[PDB]
Design a protein around this ligand. Structure first.
Ligand code: PHE
Ligand code: PHE
Ligand code: CL
Ligand code: CL
Ligand code: CL
Ligand code: CL
Lengths: 246, 244
């Protein structure tokens, strides 16, 4: 069957990833967290349009994207919204909404690094333990399928912060990120970093839902309507069209 | 519940649209089909083990008409350059995306159009804007240009669109970018695309709502993406440029 989400409480899993989901520690005299970003704005549009009660739950620190999907499949959340890549392995265990965004990956490196693209990584110009890969992500899947043939011979990373510190501290030479956030970091957060080469792994982001979900149609119709009316485009411009770096 | 498509017969609706689904007449007449869509069917059939009963939609069937026919049970799935839209999703489901999409404005070379704003500002008499009925282009026009008014020059087939542009009966039309690039680079060398692309969207395989086999088809589509087969197919069918 199918039904409307009007009146329904949804526990919505979100995962820290600037500027999709931005976590601010604030004291207001008690310490609390404030969430903002593209994802929280999207949640507000959907809530206002669909009438569900949003119960937004931030995934614990160092939760992987795979861990978030597994947690939903196990019943810890009703839906999960973020920069979450739709993959065949995930689709085996959860469903996804219509796409909220196209996606691809790029190679991130320190400026001045003598790398010109993916060919250098595939030909072994960089030792493999100096390629940083965020575990439990689509980038790990790609690496294992296309670069290393199954072997996790990369340098593992648990958060964007560890990627930052490792690259800057010269522990790794490159890493992989989704293009939207990769552009964002190199343009606003770490000006010493840059993107190199062509993008790869063309893909999409989707809202994660349970398989065979009662509310699949209601969510999909609404997401498509936001796509059609330019709301998703506006949110992308709002949160991603910025460059603080000189 | 859910299940696998192995050994199951699927009636697969396809719709003429070069070079997704290419229709040739051969002779005692018979029809041959080739294209991106037919190759995709073969890859999915080989991976999934279903039995494919491929059925071409009657001439001048619109895209809305194909979707409606599937909702009415004439087909089990429909595969083509079929735009995923909110209105269609009310009555059918869609597989994971097989491709990104957008639209562009199609015109004769030499026509002085900057882009969509000219159309929105009334630079072009509305009966000289050709719109293929029962397509996402009509939906866009009604929503963004004419305020719900069907005041365009209605087109029933891709051929009527070309004929009308070439004969000077209309000044512009809308087409999906993949097929638009194909026709302007290979078939009608005196036509061209102009302006920014608009109506960013996706193509998806049409399935019944709440379909038993939804996961099986989706996992398999995503697998074809991941392993580069969809890219290979796009390269095969769309990278040609015969026009000088
Ligand atoms: N989109 C990736 C997660 C990711 C986000 C940002 C940077 C790198 C990886 C996934 O779903 O696995
Ligand atoms: N993709 C359009 C149909 C179309 C195909 C090719 C060119 C123009 C329009 C739809 O689904 O409505
Ligand atoms: Cl989609
Ligand atoms: Cl499912
Ligand atoms: Cl998708
Ligand atoms: Cl449905």
């Amino acid at each position: 069957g199918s039904a409307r989400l009007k009146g329904i409480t949804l526990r919505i899993g979100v995962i820290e990833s600037v500027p999709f989901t931005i976590v601010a520690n604030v004291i207001d005299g008690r310490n609390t967290t404030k969430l903002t970003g593209y994802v929280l704005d999207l949640i507000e549009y959907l809530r206002d349009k669909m009438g569900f009660v949003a119960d937004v739950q931030l995934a614990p620190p160092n939760t992987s994207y795979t861990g978030l999907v597994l947690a939903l499949a196990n019943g810890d959340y009703d839906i999960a919204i973020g920069d979450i890549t739709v993959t065949s392995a995930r689709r085996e265990i959860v469903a996804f909404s219509n796409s909220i965004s196209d996606n691809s990956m790029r190679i991130l490196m320190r400026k001045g690094t003598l790398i010109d693209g993916m060919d250098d990584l595939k030909n072994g110009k960089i030792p493999y333990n100096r390629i940083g890969i965020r575990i439990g992500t689509a980038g790990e899947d790609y690496y294992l399928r296309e670069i290393s043939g199954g072997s996790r011979n990369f340098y593992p990373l648990k958060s964007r912060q560890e990627m930052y510190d490792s690259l800057l501290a010269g522990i790794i030479d490159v890493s992989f990120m989704d293009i939207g956030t990769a552009e964002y970091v190199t343009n606003n957060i770490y000006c010493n970093l840059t993107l190199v080469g062509e993008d790869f792994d063309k893909s999409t982001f989707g809202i994660v839902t349970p398989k065979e979900w009662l509310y699949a149609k209601d969510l999909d119709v609404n997401i498509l309507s936001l796509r059609e009316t330019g709301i998703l485009d506006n949110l992308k411009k709002k949160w991603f069209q910025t460059k603080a770096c000189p």
